[PDB]
Design a protein around this nucleic acid. Structure first.
Ligand SMILES: [Zn+2]
Ligand SMILES: [Zn+2]
Ligand SMILES: [Zn+2]
Ligand SMILES: [Zn+2]
Ligand SMILES: [Zn+2]
Ligand SMILES: [Zn+2]
Lengths: 86, 87
DNA sequence: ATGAATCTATTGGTCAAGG
DNA sequence: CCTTGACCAATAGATTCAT
């Protein structure tokens, strides 16, 4: 089948459905811990790795108690989302 | 009473043969084993499909340098090399 | 450094036409 | 009834940006 916007045609209709999301902006797969959403379930699994993998220490946000695997990520979360509280 | 219902989940089928393949997702049975790798599936035509990743009627075939496993897609061969041959 | 976005090849489960 | 291949979502990994 053919792409509406790009016009790029691929042998895979499943991949085209994902590609059309980039034009449409649809993000069906929503994270259960934050506002993040994406067009591919695999990419959401990758995102979920940043909320704390089992077996490693997990840092929670001081304000909203959101889990993060990496401390620098939690710092970026603070600046992006809790700047209004300073 | 026609053996159209899954004993594990209760799904009903209009084709009893579909129940036979479906049930293997509950039992883990995978009778169709690929002869060119360790792949194994529960549906005959799925193994037929997977074998297309090993080669075509003509086209070109890339074989792993170490284990001589054939591939039709080079990127797949690269993933195989990293997965099995890190030495 | 950490992670999202893009890309694509392969796979699981479904289903029913037709053999 | 069984075989078979199309269909769609899911998966896994690689590359390419963004911050
Ligand atoms: Zn497009
Ligand atoms: Zn999240
Ligand atoms: Zn927070
Ligand atoms: Zn079942
Ligand atoms: Zn194989
Ligand atoms: Zn090999």
């Amino acid at each position: 089948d053919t792409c509406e916007y790009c016009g790029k045609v691929f042998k895979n209709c499943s991949n085209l459905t994902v590609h059309r999301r980039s034009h449409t902006g649809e993000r069906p797969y929503k994270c259960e811990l934050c506002n993040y959403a994406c067009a591919q379930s695999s990419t959401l699994t990758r995102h979920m790795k940043t909320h704390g993998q089992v077996g490693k220490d997990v840092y929670k946000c001081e304000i909203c108690k959101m889990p993060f695997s990496v401390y620098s990520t939690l710092e970026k979360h603070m600046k992006k989302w809790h700047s209004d509280r300073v």
